[PDB]
Amino acid sequence: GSIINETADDIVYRLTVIIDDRYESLKNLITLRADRLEMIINDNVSTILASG
């Protein structure tokens, strides 16, 4: 494409990579922490039920 069109594509591409990376990191963190809370709750409920 033209110089200006390619520059625009370059800017959008590079920032999309940055945005996607940070997004994936936050998604993974939210998933990890939520998953752990569910694991903890599951284990704790089992322990409580086994105690009364």
Next chain:
Amino acid sequence: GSIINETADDIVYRLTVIIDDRYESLKNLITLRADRLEMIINDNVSTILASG
């Protein structure tokens, strides 16, 4: 010509779509995990109460 102004608008437009899409995805994920945890907590508490 006006191509520089138009290209700037296109860059902003394209990245806005990306930014918004990732935002919605995180918003939905956070909401989903929050809802899941609330239901899990409420269900488990009922089970515990039904046992004493």
Next chain:
Amino acid sequence: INETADDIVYRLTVIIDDRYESLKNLITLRADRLEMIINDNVSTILASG
């Protein structure tokens, strides 16, 4: 062209900030709600034995 770069950065910063504040509010409100739900349910359990 330099003012164009500033315009792009400014406009996108405004949108980035808007979505950022929305997520911050969501996270805070949902976490607050979960803490309340957890404590309320625990109180019920403690009051039941």
Next chain:
Amino acid sequence: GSIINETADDIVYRLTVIIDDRYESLKNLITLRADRLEMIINDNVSTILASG
């Protein structure tokens, strides 16, 4: 090395700084709230188990 390339690099760099800053803030907030939830769940479960 050109004016157009330096401009693209400039735009990408400046927005990356912004994106990174907001990312770190959200990361820290999620971590903080998740840590609090684990502590509150841990505290309450220990209390329940110690009460019956």
